[PDB]
Design a protein around this nucleic acid. Sequence first.
RNA 1: CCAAAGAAGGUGUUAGCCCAUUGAGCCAUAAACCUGAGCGCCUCAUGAACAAGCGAGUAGCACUGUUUGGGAAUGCAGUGUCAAGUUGGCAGGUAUUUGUCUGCCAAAGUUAAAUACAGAGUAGGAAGACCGAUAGCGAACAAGUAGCGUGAGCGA
RNA 2: AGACCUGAGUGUGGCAGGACUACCCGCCGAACUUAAGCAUAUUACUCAGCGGAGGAAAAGAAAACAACCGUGAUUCUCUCAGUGAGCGGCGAGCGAAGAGGGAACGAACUCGUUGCCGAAUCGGGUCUUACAAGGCCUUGAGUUGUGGCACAAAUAUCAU
Lengths: 213, 102, 208, 144, 203
Amino acid sequence: RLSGMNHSAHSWGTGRAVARIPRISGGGTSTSGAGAFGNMCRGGRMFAPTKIFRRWHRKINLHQKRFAVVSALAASSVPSLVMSRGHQIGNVPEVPLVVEDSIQGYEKTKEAMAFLKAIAAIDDVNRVNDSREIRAGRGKMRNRRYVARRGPMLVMPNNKGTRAFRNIFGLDLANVSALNLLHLAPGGHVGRFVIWTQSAFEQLDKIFGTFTE
Amino acid sequence: MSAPTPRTGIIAGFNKGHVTTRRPRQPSPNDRFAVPHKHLRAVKAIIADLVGLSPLEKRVQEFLRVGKEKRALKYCKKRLGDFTAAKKKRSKMEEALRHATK
Amino acid sequence: PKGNNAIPHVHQKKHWNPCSSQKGNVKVFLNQPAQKHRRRRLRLLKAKKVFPRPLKALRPQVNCPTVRHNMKRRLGRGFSPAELKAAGLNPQYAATIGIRVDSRRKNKSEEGMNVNVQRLKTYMSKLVLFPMNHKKVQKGEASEEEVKAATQDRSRFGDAAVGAVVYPSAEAPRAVSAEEKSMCVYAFLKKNHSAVRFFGTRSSRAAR
Amino acid sequence: PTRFKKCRHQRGSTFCGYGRVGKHRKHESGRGNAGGMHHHRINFDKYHPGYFGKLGMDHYHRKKNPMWKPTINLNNLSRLIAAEEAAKAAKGGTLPVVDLQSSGYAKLLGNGHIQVPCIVKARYVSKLADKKIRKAGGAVVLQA
Amino acid sequence: GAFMYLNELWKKKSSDVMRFIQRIRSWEFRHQHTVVRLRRPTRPEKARMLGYKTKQGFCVFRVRVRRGGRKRPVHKGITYGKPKTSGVLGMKLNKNNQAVAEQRLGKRFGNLRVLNSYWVNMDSTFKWYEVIAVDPMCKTIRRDPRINWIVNSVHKHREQRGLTSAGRKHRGLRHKGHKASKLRPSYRAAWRRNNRIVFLRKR
RNA sequence: CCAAAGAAGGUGUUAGCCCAUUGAGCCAUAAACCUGAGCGCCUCAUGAACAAGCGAGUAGCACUGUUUGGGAAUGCAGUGUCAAGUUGGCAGGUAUUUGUCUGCCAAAGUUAAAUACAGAGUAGGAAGACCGAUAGCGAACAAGUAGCGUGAGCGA
RNA sequence: AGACCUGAGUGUGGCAGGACUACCCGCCGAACUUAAGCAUAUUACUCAGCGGAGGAAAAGAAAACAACCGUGAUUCUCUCAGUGAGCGGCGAGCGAAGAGGGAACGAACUCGUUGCCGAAUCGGGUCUUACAAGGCCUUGAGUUGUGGCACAAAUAUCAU
Ligand SMILES: [K+]
Ligand SMILES: [K+]
Ligand SMILES: [K+]
Ligand SMILES: [K+]
Ligand SMILES: [K+]
Ligand SMILES: [K+]
Ligand SMILES: [K+]
Ligand SMILES: [K+]
Ligand SMILES: [K+]
Ligand SMILES: [K+]
Ligand SMILES: [K+]
Ligand SMILES: [K+]
Ligand SMILES: [Mg+2]
Ligand SMILES: [Mg+2]
Ligand SMILES: [Mg+2]
Ligand SMILES: [Mg+2]
Ligand SMILES: [Mg+2]
Ligand SMILES: [Mg+2]
Ligand SMILES: [Mg+2]
Ligand SMILES: [Mg+2]
Ligand SMILES: [Mg+2]
Ligand SMILES: [Mg+2]
Ligand SMILES: [Mg+2]
Ligand SMILES: [Mg+2]
Ligand SMILES: [Mg+2]
Ligand SMILES: [Mg+2]
Ligand SMILES: [Mg+2]
Ligand SMILES: [Mg+2]
Ligand SMILES: [Mg+2]
Ligand SMILES: [Mg+2]
Ligand SMILES: [Mg+2]
Ligand SMILES: [Mg+2]
Ligand SMILES: [Mg+2]
Ligand SMILES: [Mg+2]
Ligand code: NA
Ligand code: NA
Ligand code: NA
Ligand code: NA
């Protein structure tokens, strides 16, 4: 709040043949008589300095949030929508992709990678791996140095079983009890590639309901 | 100790309100404030006999000696601010006059 | 122009905005999630520290005051000594076994006293009292099997032993009574209302 | 969003929709509701009549809990009854019981036709509501 | 006990004998200093009521304050601004003379902790209050559970922050509920609550 | 080829495997802290069962000033006047005089938490849809420096 | 002579003093501004000024709300409520509280009094591994009262 305004900086008046903008007081310095207190002056105060009262967060209706999540889930099951979103699903056996729950017992990232190759999500994983690169602006000067694509999202019934899958680059992990729309439709684009465990698949009817139930 | 009168169960009336089994008012340590204070009164009587009268009390006693007791009450009310206090002071001065005579 | 708008009463003529020359008077809630996390973490830490005792002390069930809320029930500050005596507990001892005590609260009826006495009875039936010395266990003190099988309540209101506050049950459907088909409820209610509305004037008219 | 505001369309206009003659000055008509009795009187009088003056008594320390008294009508009483109970409800038989103070209401008013007969427990009632519900085969039970 | 007799005797303050005693005492006090250390309180009953004990580490000081209203210290009685803030003589201090005496004693003797004070005498120009002080470095004080609290640092110069009884009186903390809603916990705190602009996150 | 490690720093181009990191663990500790109120000993405490009173220049009240949404006065201050306690006092938001009801018991004191940190510190962290060297702090740099004013100060 | 009352001098043992000051506590306190003028009002019980603490501070255990089927120290949050409260050249403007959902909460204690005791108290020596919440001694201080016990969460305590 004090930025640009921490000077005496009175206006010289109108008798002198200079503009009427406030000028820095004193002498013996290069800054003496320099224009101050203005968005146009060097070292001055910006127009409408930014505040922390700006509305950063938003309220969304609970039913609208649930509708959005339901629509993203419905769109994730259409192979053409998943294809058009960017994912490489040309070799996967079926959409929606449901696998057995034995993957929750994996302890090695190489077992996880073997399972991914077996179910043919390795194409999308390789897509994101090849897509990794350096960001294209000041974001990399901030803490956003690297970017990559999304890749498949593996959904588990509970919090267990992610040990072998946490370190795979390009694979996201999800819990069926807490499904995020920011991950079901990245960028606002519906049609994410989702790999369901069997238990997570069977929980879907009770989690989201039915048109009648 | 009489139990309180039961309510009627309707929103309007003399005993309006939901019907419950009312309990009597339980005794409290503050119930001893209304009890007469014999020892305090005796101490105050000794101190009053020792010290005598204040100017307010002298003026009120002279007002009461002559027939003017309403004027004594007015003077007490002006000096004390309250009509109850004025009446209490006038009654105390009347009792003091009777005690002085007898 | 101005047109047809509401007359504005926004109430922002004081120096609330933090600018140069003004400290401001504002309150932002940017630490809300961090404070929620801190509160939950502190609650879990306190539960771990006071294990196996319930995190929240036992509280009575009371009726909300005004006529707008008197049909609602909630948790009180503490049990009155009358209720503790009826449940067979010393208030000073109950204050040591996790029961809140409130000397101020008066019991003006038997129903609100009986519900709280029942709460106290249930809590004392479910209570497990650890011995001061496990070698010499006194009367009313738990055995080693109970001490080893102890568990912490850690509930938001500390009412797992006694349950939530009880409400009156809804009346079952029934048939209309013969007196109910005939009685004029509005006439009855209006008569009762007017009895109090015009009590003073009726009394004055009767006196004069 | 700033990219949708009129400031972006007026880049290069040099006046931003305020004119060369009149210009955009700081406070050309006062601040706030200034001049509601002079030089804004037409606006105040034609758009907000009744603004100026005094009316009625003064109720010092108004508590709104004592005055709480929501109302419900006879044709709306099916909102407080479950569907299956209204399925079996009929005049001359067992009828559902409605507790208005627990449902959030204090007075029963009685506008329109009552769709389902019942026994309504209410603090207050209208004479028309009482008569209509007694005609329809229901009842009102006073409560507090 | 004897306390009852002393209490009633000091409630009879307008009698002849008490007026004589108070006149002699007012003369004697008038011919003394502004602050005077005493061996024993002039009113032991009042001192013991307010917290004084005949123990080592308790001290009593009689402090004198001039009577009358405040005068605004403006040069030649000249004030600039609205005519509302123009009075020089009719203004009154928002702090009572008992608090002023306690603060003078506490500021003069900074090694003592002021506990309480009581009225003893007043004449046409002066007013006398006896202030109880405690030595925080005395073993008797530091080992007594009932006066131990005053050794802590939060109680340093409590009379200057208005935490004494007279301070509470002129702060309005003698009242509760609808009589002191804007004065609790303090008027500044109530003003902060009522005037701070609140920005909820999602709004 | 590694991954329970893909973590984003360095290194002569864009590095999981060049380096540092990224984890279980391991070792060492003034006091304090925590642990059948950890556990012995000496000493010292200590638990259970064998009638009257209650805070006086106070509270009022008057006048004046001030403060409050508080309005025939919400608090407070000055000065005058000044109680009750054996229709005891106080509050119950229109002044009076009654008499009923309800809640409470002023005029000593202590007290943790939840709360502030709107131009503070100490020791650490996490950051950011922020700024990017005329910007962001006055100050990315031997910056409150060089310099200026009798000085308060001003200040690249 | 002597006392004890009041007051000195000295020795001995301490403490105060300044900094900081964002927040917090006490005082003191404007004006620009707004009212399209201006004096009440507004700004604002705010800036500047003067004191004082702390990691928080202040507040805090009912001379409380209420008017209920009642509630129950304080503090804070959402709400009440920009209010069919109120206040105001009734203009510009201003503007709370109870109830309710919560956070927190082992939350309570101490003195004076009154009864019954009455030096049992406190300092200081000395001793016990100990400037012991211990013993012993001590006129040193205190009877112009220090300490104990009981006062509603109560119904004795004091022996053995
Ligand atoms: K919403
Ligand atoms: K003076
Ligand atoms: K003047
Ligand atoms: K409040
Ligand atoms: K790298
Ligand atoms: K009464
Ligand atoms: K305090
Ligand atoms: K605060
Ligand atoms: K800080
Ligand atoms: K103007
Ligand atoms: K003001
Ligand atoms: K509540
Ligand atoms: Mg700048
Ligand atoms: Mg670029
Ligand atoms: Mg034990
Ligand atoms: Mg335009
Ligand atoms: Mg124009
Ligand atoms: Mg003043
Ligand atoms: Mg308070
Ligand atoms: Mg032990
Ligand atoms: Mg042991
Ligand atoms: Mg007085
Ligand atoms: Mg004002
Ligand atoms: Mg006001
Ligand atoms: Mg009292
Ligand atoms: Mg983050
Ligand atoms: Mg440059
Ligand atoms: Mg720069
Ligand atoms: Mg610069
Ligand atoms: Mg200031
Ligand atoms: Mg804190
Ligand atoms: Mg404190
Ligand atoms: Mg105001
Ligand atoms: Mg004593
Ligand atoms: Na791009
Ligand atoms: Na990791
Ligand atoms: Na200082
Ligand atoms: Na609340």
